[PDB]
Each structure stands twice: as C-alpha cells, then as structure tokens.
Amino acid sequence: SMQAARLAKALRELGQTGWYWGSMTVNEAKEKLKEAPEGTFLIRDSSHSDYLLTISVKTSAGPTNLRIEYQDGKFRLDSIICVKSALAAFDSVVHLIDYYVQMCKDKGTVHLYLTKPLYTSAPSLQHLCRLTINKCTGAIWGLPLPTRLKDYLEEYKFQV
Amino acid sequence: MMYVKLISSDGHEFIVKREHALTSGTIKAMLSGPGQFAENETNEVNFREIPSHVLSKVCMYFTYKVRYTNSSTEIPEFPIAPEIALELLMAANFLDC
Amino acid sequence: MDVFLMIRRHKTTIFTDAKESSTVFELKRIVEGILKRPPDEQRLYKDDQLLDDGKTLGECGFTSQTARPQAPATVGLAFRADDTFEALCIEPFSSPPELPDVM
Amino acid sequence: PVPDYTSIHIX
Amino acid sequence: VPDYTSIHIX
Ligand SMILES: [Co+2]
C-alpha cells in the first residue's frame, strides 16, 4: 500500500466508530464530558492548523483535549517530551485509541485514563455485533459465519 | 399503519412502530418500495430465517436507534450477549441495520 | 419520563413506549388501538402481579431506569374469553445455540 | 482543573 | 496486551 490509502483506511475506520464528532469546539466537548465517568473520550476535528484530529477526554481534574499528531504515516498522542521508541504510533487512529484502552484496563499531576467512548450517534447493529465479537475473541476465522461476514469482521478488529 | 408486524421464523409476531422498522434498510425497501396501487397490501413481514430470540433483539435495536438519533441525550450502551452476537450479526447484515 | 415496554401475550409482542406518569388504563387503551380489544377485556401484569388500572406505570415498577429502549420491560397481557379471563400465558422466544469453542 | 489542552509525558 | 505505563498529562 501507499500512505494515502493507509490514511484513507484509517479515516474510514474513524467514521465507523460512532464516537467521531466532526466539528466540535473545546467548550462543546467540555459540556458533553462534564459529568461523564473518568476516561470517557471522543475524537473530533482539531481547530488547529497543524492537526487533523483531537481527543477530548474526561480526566481526574475535568475534561481536556490532546491533539493527535500525524507524522511519517502514523498517529501518535501529542507529547511534551519524548523518546521515539517509547511513543506508541499507528497507521490507524482507532488502533491508537484501542491500544490505550486495552492498556488502561489496568488502572498532583493528572494521569491519562481512557475507558469508554462518548457516542455521537448509535452505530449500526452490524458494527455493534462486530465490537462484541471482537471483545469475545481475537480469532474470527474459525467462527460459524459465512466468509463474507468474516471479511466484514476483518475490516475492523478493535474493541472500541 | 403506525405499527407494522414482523414475524419470526418460529412464528412469533412482533408489532413495532413502522418508523422503527424502517431502521432496517431491507424492511424499508420492502415497505417503502413499489407495488400495485389498487391491490391490498399485507401489513406484515415474514422472515423465514430469523428466529424470535434474534428478531426480538433486533426490535430492541430499532427502538434504541430511533430514540438516540437526532437526540441531545447521552447514548448508553446497547447490550449484546456474546451468546447471541453471531446470529445477531447475520440478521443485522441481512436486514441492513 | 418515557418507559419502553414489550407487551406480551401468547406469541404476540408489542414494542411500545409510554410516560412513566401515565396509567395502566391508558396503556390498555394503547393495546386497544393495536389488538382491537377493549380495556375491560384486558388484564395487564408485571411478572405475576395484576396491575390496577388507576396506577401509573412508575407506580407499577416501570421506571426510566428499569424500562429502557435497549432493554424494555415486559408487560404481560391476558384477554377475556366471553365471561372469564384466560390465564396469563407468554410463549418463550427461541434459544441461541451453545457458544462456540473460542467464545 | 486540568488545562483545556494538554500533552502526554510517560513516567 | 500493552504493559501499563503511567502517563502524565501536563
Ligand atoms: Co503520577
């Protein structure tokens, strides 16, 4: 593949989540996340010129916003100090979120915590089933499903 | 026609709002499609391969989808038991919803 | 303020909603509009408990917490056959298979 | 309260 | 899968 195709794929994935909110200001994100559980998150467009996307997340100390860098074909969280080998970066922005949700299943300066999305709209029943299946198993090619639906499951492997 | 009847493979009859059933692209094409003007039109859809435990969950999805579309209300999880997810996926795909 | 319901009798299930503050009698009028039997030919139940016409749905236990769109509460329905009411009977839905191995 | 915009620091 | 690491957000 080439980069334009991998990025197209990542954005199509993002459009499947049900928790990509499009144009949404800082204040609107704050109002939506005010009373939400810690770790509730959504992705929206960044109003900054150098970034496509921003994560809004309910923290310990209230809602905040972390821009998502896209560099050398991969998404990574904005960081104030980094070591390249230490910062998780993925072709897929949903993969990046899913990685940190999986990491955070195990539990002064605020700590990042990501748990559950804040849906802007209800995903399709097909996609919701796919999420549930992904939470049940990583091995879908042995399931009693026609291969057309195994292909469907393969298009979106994440648990969020 | 406020309500339409959806009949499962094992003969359970689910009476649900028409607007809700239109959540299914397949049902919508069946109801809001062509036909003959002068003829009687049955207000019931039979599914030969969707059983009632699946179709009932599908109807819950219809209610959920309509309630949480174009709403300011925070959207809660739609619970799907692992034991039903494969059949429910197959039915959702057939129904385009 | 809305409660989301499955009104069930034999092999019939009606998906509908009503206000928590609306009454059992008004729910019978809803049923009347769908199944074409008058309220005095209907008994409604929560589980095995007969619901009195004058009670609100919330007073019967159907609340916005317990009767959600994605998990509606079940209301049983019995019809009057001539002079006497049928026993409440709700046909169960089918059963999924056993979970596959890798479940 | 947390600032509106933040960035990460793996400790 | 990923080993948990504390992440400060400043
Ligand atoms: Co710390």
Author numbering:
A (entry chain A): 30 to 136, 146 to 198
B (entry chain C): 16 to 112
C (entry chain B): 1 to 103
D (entry chain I): -4 to 6
E (entry chain K): -3 to 6
Question: What's the publication's text?
Answer:
SOCS proteins share a conserved domain architecture comprising of an N-terminal extended SH2 subdomain (ESS) that functions as a bridge at the interface between the SH2 domain and the SOCS box enabling ubiquitination of captured substrate, followed by a central Src-homology 2 (SH2) domain that recognizes a phosphotyrosine (pY) containing sequence, and a C-terminal SOCS box that interacts with the adapter ElonginB-ElonginC complex (EloBC). Here, we determine the co-crystal structures of SBC in complex with phosphorylated epitope peptides from its physiological targets GHR and EpoR.
Encouraged by the success in solving an SBC-EpoR structure, to deepen understanding of the SOCS2 binding epitopes, we co-crystallized SBC with an 11-mer GHR_pY595 peptide (SBC-GHR) and solved the structure at 1.98 Å resolution with 19.00% Rwork and 22.66% Rfree. The two peptides run in an anti-parallel direction relative to each other across the SH2 domain, with well-defined electron density surrounding them both. In contrast, the second peptide, peptide B, has its pY residue exposed to solvent and interacting only with His149 of SOCS2. Another hydrophobic interaction that is distinct in SBC-GHR compared to SBC-EpoR is that formed by the side chain of Val(−3) of peptide A, that nicely fits into a hydrophobic pocket comprising of Thr88, Ala90, Thr93, Leu95, and Val148 from SOCS2. In the SBC-GHR structure, a cobalt ion is modeled at a positive peak that disappeared only at 21 σ level in the unbiased Fo-Fc electron density map. This cobalt ion satisfies the formation of an octahedral coordination geometry with the side chains of His(+4) of peptide B, His149 of SOCS2 and with four surrounding water molecules.
